[PDB]
Amino acid sequence: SLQQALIVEDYQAAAETFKELLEMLGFQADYVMSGTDALHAMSTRGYDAVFIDLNLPDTSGLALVKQLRALPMEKTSKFVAVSGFKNDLGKEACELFDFYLEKPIDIASLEPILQSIE
Amino acid sequence: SLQQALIVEDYQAAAETFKELLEMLGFQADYVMSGTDALHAMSTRGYDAVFIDLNLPDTSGLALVKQLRALPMEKTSKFVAVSGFKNDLGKEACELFDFYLEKPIDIASLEPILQSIE
Numbered sequence: 001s002l003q004q005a006l007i008v009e010d011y012q013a014a015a016e017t018f019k020e021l022l023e024m025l026g027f028q029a030d031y032v033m034s035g036t037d038a039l040h041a042m043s044t045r046g047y048d049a050v051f052i053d054l055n056l057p058d059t060s061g062l063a064l065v066k067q068l069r070a071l072p073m074e075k076t077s078k079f080v081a082v083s084g085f086k087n088d089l090g091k092e093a094c095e096l097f098d099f100y101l102e103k104p105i106d107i108a109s110l111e112p113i114l115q116s117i118e
Numbered sequence: 119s120l121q122q123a124l125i126v127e128d129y130q131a132a133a134e135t136f137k138e139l140l141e142m143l144g145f146q147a148d149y150v151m152s153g154t155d156a157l158h159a160m161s162t163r164g165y166d167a168v169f170i171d172l173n174l175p176d177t178s179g180l181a182l183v184k185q186l187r188a189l190p191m192e193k194t195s196k197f198v199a200v201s202g203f204k205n206d207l208g209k210e211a212c213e214l215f216d217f218y219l220e221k222p223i224d225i226a227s228l229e230p231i232l233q234s235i236e
Contacts, residue, residue, distance in 0.1 A: 083209075090204035091220055094212040102209055 003117060006047045007031035008038045008064070009082070010057050018051065021107055025114050035059035035067070042068050047077045049117050051101070054083045054093075065096050078117050121235060124165045125149035126156045126182070127200070128175050136169065139225055143232050153177035153185070160186050165195045167235050169219070172201045172211075183214050196235050 005027045009015045015031040022029040027049070032038050035058045042050070050068060054061035065079050081097040082105065083089060089100060099113045123145045127133045133149040140147040145167070150156050153176045160168070168186060172179035183197050199215040200223065201207060207218060217231045 086205060086208035088204070089208055089212055091201075091207060091218050094207055094215070094218050097212070100209050100212050 003027045003048045003114065004046070005029040005049045005051065006038065006041055006045075006077075008033075008035070008050065008052045008056065008061075010034065010053070018105060021105065021110060022114075025107060025110060027114065033057075035064045038064060039067060039071070042071050042073070042077075046074055048075075049080060049113070050077045051080045051082055052097075054081055054085075054088050062093055062096065069096065078113075080113060121145045121166045121232065122164070123147040123167045123169065124156065124159055124163075124195075126151075126153070126168065126170045126174065126179075128152065128171070136223060139223065139228060140232075143225060143228060145232065151175075153182045156182060157185060157189070160189050160191070160195075164192055166193075167198060167231070168195045169198045169200055170215075172199055172203075172206050180211055180214065187214065196231075198231060 005022050007015055007018050007029055009018060009031060010033045019029045019031055032041050035056050052061040052065055056064065061081060078098040080099040080101055081093060082101045082103065084103045101109055123140050125133055125136050125147055127136060127149060128151045137147045137149055150159050153174050170179040170183055174182065179199060196216040198217040198219055199211060200219045202221045219227055
């Protein structure tokens with residue numbers, strides 16, 4: 001089957017690259033550029049993996065993952081924190097994300113995540 | 119049955135209190151006061167849960183959990199980080215511990231951990 005990923009990231013060019021990488025590894029991937037859009041996206045469509053930048057225009061990544069987890073989901077997504085920085089991942093981030101990525105993202109760091117999700 | 123816990127903590131008085139709390143919640147618990155002793159303890163005995171202070175005399179909690187995970191274990195333990203501090207839990211700490219506690223420890227914060235392990 002095809003795994004489906006949602007990317008949450010406000011920089012278009014970063015989002016498209018990320019989306020290219022996921023696709024090269026066999027995922028179908030959408031991106032949205034805000035927490036609000038992510039909530040609307042996760043309403044309507046189900047995802048196997050959701051990648052959340054911890055720095056968003058309208059919210060923190062942490063406050064967003066708490067909302068998305070509380071949405072009614074047929075099946076439960078795996079949630080991945082994408083950070084530039086100890087600084088960004090405290091106790092609750094450890095608890096509420098399933099996987100963690102540090103920028104810059106590349107196929108090597110993505111591959112084991114996509115392997116666990118499968 | 120009885121769940122068995124190992125506490126890794128160098129301050130005797132803190133260790134005994136911690137051990138009292140776990141016991142009040144239905145665990146049998148030993149404590150050791152160094153990374154070295156933890157390695158020797160996990161050699162000889164199996165544990166369901168291992169609580170590691172992130173500040174140890176002979177090692178970091180993080181470097182210790184990587185060693186303990188690599189020991190040959192009949193069954194795999196759950197590993198809990200016990201920290202005073204975002205500051206102490208980065209990317210690898212999120213990945214290598216299963217549960218996270220912030221000091222000061224009490225029965226309320228322990229209870230959900232012990233419930234998951236069961």
